[PDB]
Amino acid sequence: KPNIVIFYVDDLGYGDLSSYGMEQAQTPNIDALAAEGIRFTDAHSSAATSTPSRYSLLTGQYAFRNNAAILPGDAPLIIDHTKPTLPKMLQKAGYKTGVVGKWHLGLGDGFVDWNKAVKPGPIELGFDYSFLIPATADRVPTVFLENHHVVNLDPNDPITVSYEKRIGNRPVGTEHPELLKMSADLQHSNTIVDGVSRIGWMAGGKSAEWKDEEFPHIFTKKAIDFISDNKDESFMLFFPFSDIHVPRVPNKMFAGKSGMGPRGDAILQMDWMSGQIIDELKKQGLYDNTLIIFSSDNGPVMDDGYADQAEELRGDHDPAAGYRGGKYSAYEAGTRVPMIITYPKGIKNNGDSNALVSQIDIYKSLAELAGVKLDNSEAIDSKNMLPAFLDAKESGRTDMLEESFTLAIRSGKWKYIAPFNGTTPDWLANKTAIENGLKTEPQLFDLSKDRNEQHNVADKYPKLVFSLQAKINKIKARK
Amino acid sequence: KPNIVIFYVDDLGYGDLSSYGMEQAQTPNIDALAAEGIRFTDAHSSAATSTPSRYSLLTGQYAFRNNAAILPGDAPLIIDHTKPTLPKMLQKAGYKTGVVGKWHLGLGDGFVDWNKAVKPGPIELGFDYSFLIPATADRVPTVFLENHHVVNLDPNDPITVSYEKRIGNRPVGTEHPELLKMSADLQHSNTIVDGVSRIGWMAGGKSAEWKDEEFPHIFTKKAIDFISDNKDESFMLFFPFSDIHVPRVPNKMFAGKSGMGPRGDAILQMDWMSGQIIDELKKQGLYDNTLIIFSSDNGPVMDDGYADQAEELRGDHDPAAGYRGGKYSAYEAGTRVPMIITYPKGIKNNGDSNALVSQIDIYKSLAELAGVKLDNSEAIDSKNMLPAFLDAKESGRTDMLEESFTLAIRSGKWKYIAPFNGTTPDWLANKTAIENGLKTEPQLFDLSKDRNEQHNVADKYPKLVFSLQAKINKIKARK
Ligand SMILES: O=S(=O)(O)OC[C@H]1O[C@@H](O)[C@H](O)[C@@H](O)[C@H]1O
Ligand SMILES: O=S(=O)(O)OC[C@H]1O[C@@H](O)[C@H](O)[C@@H](O)[C@H]1O
Ligand SMILES: [Ca+2]
Numbered sequence: 001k002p003n004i005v006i007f008y009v010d011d012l013g014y015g016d017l018s019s020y021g022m023e024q025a026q027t028p029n030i031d032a033l034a035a036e037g038i039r040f041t042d043a044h045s046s047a048a049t050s051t052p053s054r055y056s057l058l059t060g061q062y063a064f065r066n067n068a069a070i071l072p073g074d075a076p077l078i079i080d081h082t083k084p085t086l087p088k089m090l091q092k093a094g095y096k097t098g099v100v101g102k103w104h105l106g107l108g109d110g111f112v113d114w115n116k117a118v119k120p121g122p123i124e125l126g127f128d129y130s131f132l133i134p135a136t137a138d139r140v141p142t143v144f145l146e147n148h149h150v151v152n153l154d155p156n157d158p159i160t161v162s163y164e165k166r167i168g169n170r171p172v173g174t175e176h177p178e179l180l181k182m183s184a185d186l187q188h189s190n191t192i193v194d195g196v197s198r199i200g201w202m203a204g205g206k207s208a209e210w211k212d213e214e215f216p217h218i219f220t221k222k223a224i225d226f227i228s229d230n231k232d233e234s235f236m237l238f239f240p241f242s243d244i245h246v247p248r249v250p251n252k253m254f255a256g257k258s259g260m261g262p263r264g265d266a267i268l269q270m271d272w273m274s275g276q277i278i279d280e281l282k283k284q285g286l287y288d289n290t291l292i293i294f295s296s297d298n299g300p301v302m303d304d305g306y307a308d309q310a311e312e313l314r315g316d317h318d319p320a321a322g323y324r325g326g327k328y329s330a331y332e333a334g335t336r337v338p339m340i341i342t343y344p345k346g347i348k349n350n351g352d353s354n355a356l357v358s359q360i361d362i363y364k365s366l367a368e369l370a371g372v373k374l375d376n377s378e379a380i381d382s383k384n385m386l387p388a389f390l391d392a393k394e395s396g397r398t399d400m401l402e403e404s405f406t407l408a409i410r411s412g413k414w415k416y417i418a419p420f421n422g423t424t425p426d427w428l429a430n431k432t433a434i435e436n437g438l439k440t441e442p443q444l445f446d447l448s449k450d451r452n453e454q455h456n457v458a459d460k461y462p463k464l465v466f467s468l469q470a471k472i473n474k475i476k477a478r479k
Numbered sequence: 480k481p482n483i484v485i486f487y488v489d490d491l492g493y494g495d496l497s498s499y500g501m502e503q504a505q506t507p508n509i510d511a512l513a514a515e516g517i518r519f520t521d522a523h524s525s526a527a528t529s530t531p532s533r534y535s536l537l538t539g540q541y542a543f544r545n546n547a548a549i550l551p552g553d554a555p556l557i558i559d560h561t562k563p564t565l566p567k568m569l570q571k572a573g574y575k576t577g578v579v580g581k582w583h584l585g586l587g588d589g590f591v592d593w594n595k596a597v598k599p600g601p602i603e604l605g606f607d608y609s610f611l612i613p614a615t616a617d618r619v620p621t622v623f624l625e626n627h628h629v630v631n632l633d634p635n636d637p638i639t640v641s642y643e644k645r646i647g648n649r650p651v652g653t654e655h656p657e658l659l660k661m662s663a664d665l666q667h668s669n670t671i672v673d674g675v676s677r678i679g680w681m682a683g684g685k686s687a688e689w690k691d692e693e694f695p696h697i698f699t700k701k702a703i704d705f706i707s708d709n710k711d712e713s714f715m716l717f718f719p720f721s722d723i724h725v726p727r728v729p730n731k732m733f734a735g736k737s738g739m740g741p742r743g744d745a746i747l748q749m750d751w752m753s754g755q756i757i758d759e760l761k762k763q764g765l766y767d768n769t770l771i772i773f774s775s776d777n778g779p780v781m782d783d784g785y786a787d788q789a790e791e792l793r794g795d796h797d798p799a800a801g802y803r804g805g806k807y808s809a810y811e812a813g814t815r816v817p818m819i820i821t822y823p824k825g826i827k828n829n830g831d832s833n834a835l836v837s838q839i840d841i842y843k844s845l846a847e848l849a850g851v852k853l854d855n856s857e858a859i860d861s862k863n864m865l866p867a868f869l870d871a872k873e874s875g876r877t878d879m880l881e882e883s884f885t886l887a888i889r890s891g892k893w894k895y896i897a898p899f900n901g902t903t904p905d906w907l908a909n910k911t912a913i914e915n916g917l918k919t920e921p922q923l924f925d926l927s928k929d930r931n932e933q934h935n936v937a938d939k940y941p942k943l944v945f946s947l948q949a950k951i952n953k954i955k956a957r958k
């Protein structure tokens with residue numbers, strides 16, 4: 001039974017790898033995986049934002065089924081811990097499980113006292129070991145959580161977090177721009193730590209504050225500690241990167257080296273972080289009997305809140321590589337992300353694969369790998385794609401959901417986006433460089449003639465529109 | 480029968496890899512090789528300069544036995560095309576052979592007419608295909624030699640080359656500093672090509688003129704085509720980089736990216752080119768039955784002829800990694816260079832290896848691997864080291880010669896340098912930033928206690944000094 005490692009990059013776009021087209025900088029370590037293994041060209045995150053994609057990846061359930069949406073850093077755990085989870089399925093098969101990186105699935109069951117035992121958390125979800133950034137890099141609280149406790153927390157300088165009003169004695173970005181390494185939009189202009197303002201306020205916790213620049217070393221180290229401690233048994237590591245999420249404050253090992261600014265330097269950081277872990281697996285002789293899944297939680301974004309020159313220094317770079325949309329979108333670039341799989345022992349055919357695969361398929365696929373029988377209720381929306389994960393010649397799905405602020409479905413070459421008639425959060429206004437694809441009219445595209453989704457042919461094909469819409473409706477009605 | 484790829488870097492120091500301690504730049508493709516295979520810490524080129532090390536590589540025979548030393552671009556071939564070579568030996572075992580990169584071994588047998596079929600050359604030494612820089616990048620002729628003919632030669636505009644006198648209409652660096660990308664010493668201030676002045680003068684051949692900045696594309700493209708043409712037979716690629724020899728004119732992809740200027744930038748270019756070919760083997764499915772040898776032709780130099788900010792932008796980087804000497808030197812860093820070997824289908828044990836081994840042993844090791852018996856008189860100074868090469872727990876040599884302007888020998892922990900009572904090139908006086916170990920006294924070091932050869936114990940060990948000189952004497956006298 002192989003080891004499992006899931007490299008999970010924050011906001012990595014389809015074209016954000018040199019093995020997926022990037023010319024202005026290279027990602028040699030990740031590029032090496034694609035050369036050896038299977039490079040997926042029609043693989044998808046379950047959603048176009050973070051919290052819902054992670055929810056599906058770990059539960060095998062569509063995010064809308066529990067209304068999963070981008071969370072604050074003090075939100076309660078959105079996964080019901082009394083139910084099967086992907087890591088839980090693996091412990092069953094005898095795996096040691098661990099997660100090192102950004103969480104963003106919630107913590108606790110109502111009110112998080114950051115100075116006491118924090119639970120339910122990952123450990124209650126079937127992870128033997130955890131070391132987390134609570135939410136995202138740009139949200140408070142601004143600390144690491146190891147298993148059930150905040151790291152380097154001092155009793156006499158206790159932590160409190162607010163998303164309602166300003167608390168504590170830390171400067172805030174709006175009032176002290178001279179303390180800011182980069183300027184930030186109003187949503188991101190609250191409590192300053194390590195010269196960067198964040199979303200929300202945090203009081204206390206000086207001993208426990210993180211230093212963004214120190215991430216690549218902190219997180220690779222904990223990972224390697226986990227691989228070391230558990231090398232004598234079957235282990236699974238979930239490594240959700242904070243990179244390349246804002247704020248991009250890359251390490252000086254990378255800063256200014258991509259020629260694309262902090263966004264590009266962050267891609268570089270990710271690729272070096274990946275390499276440290278892969279190479280350790282190589283040195284310790286674990287690599288050949290390890291299945292590595294490398295992917296992303298959603299599509300790319302340039303300016304996501306900070307004045308980090310992403311647009312000014314982008315040049316010719318296209319982080320979606322010719323697909324319409326990006327982060328937050330129902331268009332292909334919202335969910336169509338790099339996925340690369342390596343497993344020397346088990347891959348029958350290396351090469352590029354265009355199997356229609358969604359990250360929600362990982363659940364049942366690993367189950368088959370681990371030899372675990374699933375309940376009829378466990379991972380209901382998941383499908384076994386293990387053949388297509390190990391053979392670039394196998395096909396994957398017939399049809400596939402993509403979740404955004406609306407819902408969209410792929411059925412072969414067809415791309416349908418259901419009409420949206422709700423309201424969207426105020427911060428979405430900031431992201432208009434990206435076409436979100438939310439219209440009150442139906443949209444239908446043939447990606448085989450129209451890869452970029454520029455020609456809506458729903459008036460040409462009402463037969464098809466009605467069909468695919470009922471499919472989305474029927475999916476929502478699955479009981 | 481495994482394929483064989485030899486990556487052979489120019490002037491690569493023991494510490495010019497982050498897998499060997501380099502901190503100011505990252506060499507991920509080469510470090511990935513190190514992590515998977517065996518990383519050698521006591522591995523040596525035969526000599527502390529280019530031509531002789533290359534000579535002992537292909538002949539399995541010490542350089543002094545033919546007075547082999549750094550050659551001008553118009554020197555006749557110094558390897559006897561009538562006698563066996565490493566490529567010829569491989570041809571006996573069925574391999575399709577090729578060399579892409581620099582040569583520096585000489586061409587022809589006296590007068591080279593560059594506008595006609597150049598023979599003898601690499602082809603008569605058992606190479607099926609060759610694409611070459613005839614000498615060094617800082618040496619005329621600045622053209623490519625493909626098999627027996629100059630690439631993109633226009634017969635109306637014939638090439639002539641001289642190292643004695645100025646010929647032709649091209650400007651020289653001594654008259655036109657305004658035309659240069661960087662300033663040079665007077666040795667390197669002759670003919671200007673692509674905005675860099677060379678050693679010696681070249682008339683004619685405008686269409687053949689290469690461009691340093693395109694070297695990575697041109698040469699990785701000829702290597703990959705060589706592979707992709709012979710993916711179906713057993714083959715061997717000798718891939719002698721011009722990186723990182725002076726002039727350092729890195730492609731814009733790497734310019735300014737290392738922090739250490741052109742010298743470090745050439746290291747990044749080296750690594751990118753390695754990954755291009757590594758990734759090719761992996762994509763075509765060849766990697767697992769391919770043995771890769773990665774090493775260097777001699778130790779490191781900072782300033783070697785051009786003003787390229789090597790020293791200024793060094794920081795705290797030590798290319799000799801604490802070893803004494805370097806390029807041209809009789810001290811350890813003159814020959815002790817990085818060496819790495821992978822061969823997924825053959826490596827017994829991976830890891831780090833302190834086997835005392837030399838590049839002269841690659842001949843007889845490969846002849847075991849290819850199963851070819853050698854004459855009593857073939858590769859006579861070569862020894863089979865295949866077990867140390869493929870098993871990180873295996874040891875190597877009892878003794879080992881090191882060649883420079885004097886002779887030295889390693890004898891386990893012992894290092895002895897034979898006194899030097901001779902004369903040296905005026906240009907070596909441009910190289911005094913490095914200690915060359917040329918002394919009229921004998922030198923003895925216990926590398927066990929004195930890694931950086933600081934304490935000459937010739938006085939404390941008169942009998943040992945006699946024994947090791949004696950062996951050097953006996954080694955010269957081998958008929
Ligand atoms: O990948 S995500 O965690 O979904 O990104 C979360 C996003 O939420 C938005 O409200 C912020 O303006 C963004 O700056 C970003 O933090
Ligand atoms: O790497 S080597 O080919 O050994 O170096 C040859 C050297 O010859 C010397 O005359 C020059 O001053 C150096 O610039 C360098 O070209
Ligand atoms: Ca995300």
Ligand SMILES: [Ca+2]
Nearest residue numbers: 489490529777
């Ligand atoms: Ca050299």
